Amino acid sequence: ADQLTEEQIAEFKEAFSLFDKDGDGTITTKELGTVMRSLGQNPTEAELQDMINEVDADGNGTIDFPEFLTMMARKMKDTDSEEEIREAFRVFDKDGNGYISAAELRHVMTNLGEKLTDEEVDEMIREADIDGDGQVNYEEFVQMMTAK
């Protein structure tokens, strides 16, 4: 009985709406450009178009639910999980002090488009606060991610 991996694909369905602010089922270089500024800056509608062209399975000019998933598994495979972790940590550590912070976690979730209480941010720290210092250090951050 060779089962499938559709269980993981369900998670990407719930994340797709977060990336598509219009909830119309498709993301356009203009919409994603807002996320790029939050990471550092906005690319260019010319260059943004080339990125979608290599991932456009149909060639319509936009990324659909099934097209977005194929690119995700293709990028991580040719890349290493160690590389995506280093990039994500650097994005959360805006002040670059060695660890994150309650204010650092809340700034990204709100910037992403989700509303949570300050208590919601504190618990996130508890999950990676093995030493009990109230802050997540670099070592605690990687261990919790590769715990299993």
Binding site: A15, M36, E84, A88, R90, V91
Partner: peptide, 19 residues
Amino acid sequence: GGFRRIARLVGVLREWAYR
């Protein structure tokens, strides 16, 4: 939502800007 699940999506943000 699990904290580990959120980290996977963050890694995708920098890769998109890589190219």
